[PDB]
Nucleic acid binder design. Structure first.
Ligand SMILES: [Mg+2]
Ligand SMILES: [Mg+2]
Length: 678
DNA sequence: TGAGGTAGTAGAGT
RNA sequence: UCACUACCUCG
């Protein structure tokens, strides 16, 4: 089922001979740099050298004649001087096809774009972003409309412009002025005189014209010397820290800093905060900006790139009988059923089950295979030991899950409770007390949650795919698994299960935690399906390096099971627009060779497609996406809308956020098949 | 604690 | 990229 789409991408003139072979230059430093300061230096050499020059491995490359370049000089860095000397070595062929050779011609490209944007006037330029419109306003803050840009070289050897509309948030106040009129201290702050940022620790009381700095020179006097106090009024002392060592406090003046605002627009003298846009309005705005930018780039007219898209088959979601969203099963019956025993704990004003909720479940179960039993919890949490007594009995009386009716709780308490009950072997769902059965979606979801935690498989996928087991990995340390993380798997009926890496105190071998996770997963599966997966689908947030998966990919290799490793990123797939007609769910867009885009959802703004990369395996992208897309509907606690990410990933994401704030210890007997974290 | 989407913040000292 | 907040959204 083919179709073609438009990317927020525009083709431009191919790289002429000149641009085809950049100039190369040797770089001699003084005093000798290091092995950790070496590369962070070259990037600076190319900068002081001027022109369109970039670091090309050992030395730097350039689209500028060595004439315009300052082929010799000095450079400081954290209070250390340096002396360099550039030597042309003529030129060197370069390849558009070659992974690496391209990367250079693209870096030059961004630099080419970088220099053009800086010479534009009447525009707020920040990096590669270009802002030009008054959109919102308010007590000293203004949200400007603009676009985030990017120019790189393609496989063909042509220029590629990337455009996508965006809003920037600017404060034309100054820390002092900001605070001076009833505003909290911002997390981050920026220099009024330049572009660097810092972490704002705390305000100081030291006298600005007295506080001495390395040397003896006054704090104030130090800035004034540089002219950045002219027309400004550096008030109180403020303490900040560099985003490299957020521990070493540095002195700064509140009058020379500017708060880094973040959607705290608390008034609108220009407009509503609607910072989103509909797909053909932004598409329109894209074509424009792109035409403009390309206009003053001088790279020729921008050609929007058409791409080959495929329409993936809609998934058949079943409960007792076919259904659309999970919430329907609450009336159509569940997929796999039997007696569950749900207990009720009320932490508000009265005693029983709100009529509707009781009838809701009764019907749901009546609609599904077997029927349920409904207990109430006699003890309140304050009764201390008395409470746990009733609990440990109800855990034996069958109760597999608790439904908590209570007013909003500070997460301080919300955690206490869930922790207790859980260590007692009782998953729990909360539902805030002021509740009217008008709010279908709210209690309905609450109910769907209870049953997912109770341990029921609400819906399932009618069919078979290449991988019987799909497992998603999520880490708790954005960088890697050296601090743990969890995993979630689905595949089969379709029974979903979670897994947790045993508790450590320090750092663990990243690639061992992952094997730790995968094997535990395969055991729970074997022991639950009696079979060992012929093939596995491994999903990851591509946040972490790909080698942390080495041990496991070789482990599976010694068990005889085949796999595919796919990395799923939520950012960076740009946008996709329908040529003519509307777009549908499950649009599969293959791009550069091991990558593709997935528009898993739509049904307000513009869908943000997922960018996936097949890092290992051999099954074809088509079958991969088809399956990943289908996994999009297996999320238990949705009921009224499907998530953007595949159930395994979306599950691990929320399981790593729970273990985080609850306490991995208490996760004693909790069946690895009762999704307590949803 | 209903939950999902989009949409912004972002990770040469002073 | 997580938490954050806004807005809907819920045939
Ligand atoms: Mg994640
Ligand atoms: Mg929940």
């Amino acid at each position: 089922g083919k179709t073609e789409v438009f990317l927020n991408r525009f083709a431009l003139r191919p790289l002429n001979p000149e641009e085809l072979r950049p100039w190369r230059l040797e770089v001699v430093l003084d005093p000798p740099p290091g092995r950790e300061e070496v590369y962070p230096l070259l990037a600076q050499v190319a900068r002081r050298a001027g022109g369109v020059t970039v670091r090309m491995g050992d030395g730097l490359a350039s689209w500028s004649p060595p004439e315009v370049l300052v082929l010799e000089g000095t450079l400081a860095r954290m209070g250390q001087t340096y002396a360099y000397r550039l030597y042309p070595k003529g030129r060197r062929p370069l390849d558009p096809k070659d992974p690496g050779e391209r990367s250079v011609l693209s870096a030059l490209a961004r630099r080419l774009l970088q220099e053009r944007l800086r010479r534009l006037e009447g525009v707020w330029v920040e990096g590669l972003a270009v802002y030009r419109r008054e959109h919102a306003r308010g007590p000293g803050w203004r949200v400007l409309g603009g676009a985030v840009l990017d120019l790189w070289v393609s496989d063909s050897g042509a220029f590629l412009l990337e455009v996508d509309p965006a809003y920037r948030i600017l404060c034309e106040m100054s820390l002092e002025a900001w605070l001076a009129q009833g505003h909290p201290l911002p997390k981050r702050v920026r220099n009024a005189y330049d572009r660097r940022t810092w972490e704002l620790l705390r305000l100081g009381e030291e006298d600005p014209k007295e506080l001495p700095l390395p040397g003896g020179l006054s704090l104030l006097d130090y800035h004034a010397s540089k002219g950045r106090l002219q027309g400004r009024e550096g008030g109180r002392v403020a303490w900040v820290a560099d985003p490299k060592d957020p521990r070493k406090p540095i002195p700064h003046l509140t009058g020379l800093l500017v708060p880094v605002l973040t959607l705290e627009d608390l008034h609108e003298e220009e407009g509503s905060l609607a910072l989103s846009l509909p797909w053909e309005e932004r598409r329109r705005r894209t074509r424009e900006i792109a035409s403009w930018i390309g206009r003053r780039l001088g790279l020729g007219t921008p050609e929007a790139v058409r791409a080959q898209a495929y329409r993936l088959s809609i998934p058949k979601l079943m409960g007792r009988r076919a259904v659309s969203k999970p919430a329907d099963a609450l009336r159509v019956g569940f997929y796999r059923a039997q007696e569950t025993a749900l207990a009720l704990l009320r932490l508000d004003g009265a005693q029983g089950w709100p009529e509707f909720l009781r009838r809701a479940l009764l019907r749901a179960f009546g609609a599904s295979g077997a029927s349920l039993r409904l207990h109430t919890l006699h003890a309140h949490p304050s009764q201390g030991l008395a409470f746990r007594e009733a609990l440990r009995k109800a855990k034996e009386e069958g109760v597999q899950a608790v439904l908590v009716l209570t007013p909003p709780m500070a997460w301080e308490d919300r955690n206490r409770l869930k922790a207790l009950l859980l260590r007692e072997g009782l998953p729990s769902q909360i539902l805030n007390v002021p509740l009217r059965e008008e709010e279908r979606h709210r209690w309905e979801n609450a109910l769907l949650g209870l049953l997912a935690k109770a341990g029921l498989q609400v819906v399932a996928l009618s069919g078979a795919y290449p991988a019987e087991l799909a497992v998603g990995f999520d880490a708790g340390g954005r960088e890697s698994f050296r601090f743990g993380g969890a995993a979630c798997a689905v595949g089969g009926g379709g029974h979903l299960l979670w897994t947790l890496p045993e508790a450590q105190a320090g750092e663990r071998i990243p690639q061992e935690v992952v094997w730790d996770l995968l094997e535990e997963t395969l055991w729970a599966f074997r022991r639950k399906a009696g079979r060992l997966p012929s093939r596995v689908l491994l999903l990851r947030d591509g946040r972490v390096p790909q080698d942390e998966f080495a041990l496991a990919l070789e482990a599976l290799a010694r068990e005889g099971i085949a796999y595919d490793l796919v990395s799923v990123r939520k950012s960076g797939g740009g946008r996709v627009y329908p040529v003519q007609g509307r777009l549908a769910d499950g649009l599969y867009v293959p791009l550069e060779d091991k990558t593709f885009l997935l528009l898993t959802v739509h049904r307000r703004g513009t869908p943000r497609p997922l960018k996936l990369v097949h890092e290992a395996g051999d099954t074809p992208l088509e079958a991969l996406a088809h399956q990943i897309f289908h996994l999009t509907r297996l999320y238990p606690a949705s009921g009224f809308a499907f998530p953007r990410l595949p159930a395994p990933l979306h599950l691990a994401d929320r399981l790593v956020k729970e273990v985080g704030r609850l306490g991995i210890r208490h996760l004693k007997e909790v069946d690895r098949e009762k999704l307590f974290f949803v």
